[PDB]
Design an enzyme around this catalytic site. Sequence first.
Site, PDB file in Angstrom:
ATOM      1  N   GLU A   1       0.784  -1.234   0.000  1.00  0.00           N
ATOM      2  CA  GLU A   1       0.000   0.000   0.000  1.00  0.00           C
ATOM      3  C   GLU A   1       0.818   1.288   0.000  1.00  0.00           C
ATOM      4  O   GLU A   1       0.270   2.362  -0.252  1.00  0.00           O
ATOM      5  CB  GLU A   1      -0.923  -0.025   1.214  1.00  0.00           C
ATOM      6  CG  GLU A   1      -1.845  -1.252   1.120  1.00  0.00           C
ATOM      7  CD  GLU A   1      -3.064  -1.120   0.225  1.00  0.00           C
ATOM      8  OE1 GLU A   1      -3.898  -1.992   0.069  1.00  0.00           O
ATOM      9  OE2 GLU A   1      -3.156   0.036  -0.374  1.00  0.00           O
TER      10      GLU A   1
ATOM     11  N   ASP B   1      -6.324   6.287  -4.645  1.00  0.00           N
ATOM     12  CA  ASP B   1      -5.847   4.911  -4.772  1.00  0.00           C
ATOM     13  C   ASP B   1      -5.977   4.386  -6.197  1.00  0.00           C
ATOM     14  O   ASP B   1      -6.305   5.158  -7.111  1.00  0.00           O
ATOM     15  CB  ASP B   1      -6.509   3.966  -3.756  1.00  0.00           C
ATOM     16  CG  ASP B   1      -7.932   3.652  -4.017  1.00  0.00           C
ATOM     17  OD1 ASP B   1      -8.559   3.036  -3.198  1.00  0.00           O
ATOM     18  OD2 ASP B   1      -8.479   4.053  -5.158  1.00  0.00           O
TER      19      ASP B   1
ATOM     20  N   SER C   1     -12.263 -20.133  -4.738  1.00  0.00           N
ATOM     21  CA  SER C   1     -10.871 -19.999  -4.299  1.00  0.00           C
ATOM     22  C   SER C   1     -10.783 -20.410  -2.820  1.00  0.00           C
ATOM     23  O   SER C   1      -9.868 -21.117  -2.406  1.00  0.00           O
ATOM     24  CB  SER C   1     -10.440 -18.522  -4.431  1.00  0.00           C
ATOM     25  OG  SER C   1      -9.872 -18.365  -5.737  1.00  0.00           O
TER      26      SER C   1
ATOM     27  N   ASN D   1      -7.290 -20.197  -9.697  1.00  0.00           N
ATOM     28  CA  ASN D   1      -8.622 -19.647  -9.549  1.00  0.00           C
ATOM     29  C   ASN D   1      -8.599 -18.208  -9.084  1.00  0.00           C
ATOM     30  O   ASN D   1      -9.404 -17.392  -9.510  1.00  0.00           O
ATOM     31  CB  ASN D   1      -9.527 -20.487  -8.649  1.00  0.00           C
ATOM     32  CG  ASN D   1     -10.965 -20.031  -8.589  1.00  0.00           C
ATOM     33  OD1 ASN D   1     -11.405 -19.203  -7.750  1.00  0.00           O
ATOM     34  ND2 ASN D   1     -11.748 -20.586  -9.507  1.00  0.00           N
TER      35      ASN D   1
ATOM     36  N   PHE E   1      -7.988  -6.542   3.611  1.00  0.00           N
ATOM     37  CA  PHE E   1      -7.669  -5.136   3.802  1.00  0.00           C
ATOM     38  C   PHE E   1      -7.938  -4.414   2.465  1.00  0.00           C
ATOM     39  O   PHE E   1      -8.463  -3.318   2.407  1.00  0.00           O
ATOM     40  CB  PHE E   1      -6.145  -5.060   4.016  1.00  0.00           C
ATOM     41  CG  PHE E   1      -5.616  -3.709   4.385  1.00  0.00           C
ATOM     42  CD1 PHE E   1      -5.304  -2.779   3.398  1.00  0.00           C
ATOM     43  CD2 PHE E   1      -5.362  -3.374   5.718  1.00  0.00           C
ATOM     44  CE1 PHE E   1      -4.786  -1.528   3.755  1.00  0.00           C
ATOM     45  CE2 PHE E   1      -4.825  -2.133   6.087  1.00  0.00           C
ATOM     46  CZ  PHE E   1      -4.540  -1.196   5.091  1.00  0.00           C
TER      47      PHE E   1
ATOM     48  N   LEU F   1      -8.436   3.939   3.121  1.00  0.00           N
ATOM     49  CA  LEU F   1      -9.485   4.502   2.258  1.00  0.00           C
ATOM     50  C   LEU F   1     -10.327   5.494   3.045  1.00  0.00           C
ATOM     51  O   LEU F   1     -10.789   5.158   4.146  1.00  0.00           O
ATOM     52  CB  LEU F   1     -10.408   3.368   1.747  1.00  0.00           C
ATOM     53  CG  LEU F   1     -11.638   3.900   0.979  1.00  0.00           C
ATOM     54  CD1 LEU F   1     -11.251   4.554  -0.376  1.00  0.00           C
ATOM     55  CD2 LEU F   1     -12.555   2.704   0.706  1.00  0.00           C
TER      56      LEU F   1
HETATM   57  K   LIG Z   1      -2.153   2.598  -1.937  1.00  0.00           K
END
Ligand SMILES: [K+]
Length: 164
Positions: A11, A20, A117, A132, A104, A32
């Site tokens: 991130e 983002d 999955s 997958n 996250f 966020l």
């Molecule tokens: K980021």
Amino acid sequence: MNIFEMLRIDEGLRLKIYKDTEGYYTIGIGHLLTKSPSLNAAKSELDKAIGRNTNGVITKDEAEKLFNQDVDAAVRGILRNAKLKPVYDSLDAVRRAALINMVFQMGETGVAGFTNSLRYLQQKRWDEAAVNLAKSRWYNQTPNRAKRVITTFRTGTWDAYKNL
Ligand SMILES: [K+]
Ligand SMILES: [Cl-]
Ligand SMILES: [Cl-]
């Protein structure tokens, strides 16, 4: 390597409001703020989040504080989810970190929808799970990051984060 270092690699760290990969206002280590196209709105969420009138810039400590909260919330979200919990409980530590990573990024609900999955992962069918996982909007929009996470679920090692 650990979940914090992993997500810090995935991130980045920015102390001023920025957008983002999806175009949404965010700050810190992937925190966020809102999906709104309104910067004022983002600022209002930031101030509420931090507890002060910030004018869109925070300190490193502040950024780390929200990050700690976000990691904890991802974990909590997995633990509370009927679909994610059993998967998470069935995995080793490295793989558990991979799942926290996805939550996250996309939220509990979003990851909970990767039915197939999840089943492969629960079954420990590593290669199948990896294949997958790749068949997703997630992988197509953020392929490098997805590749890292998928490699982590495939091998149970931190090789994809090694050297970063
Ligand atoms: K980021
Ligand atoms: Cl918050
Ligand atoms: Cl990417």
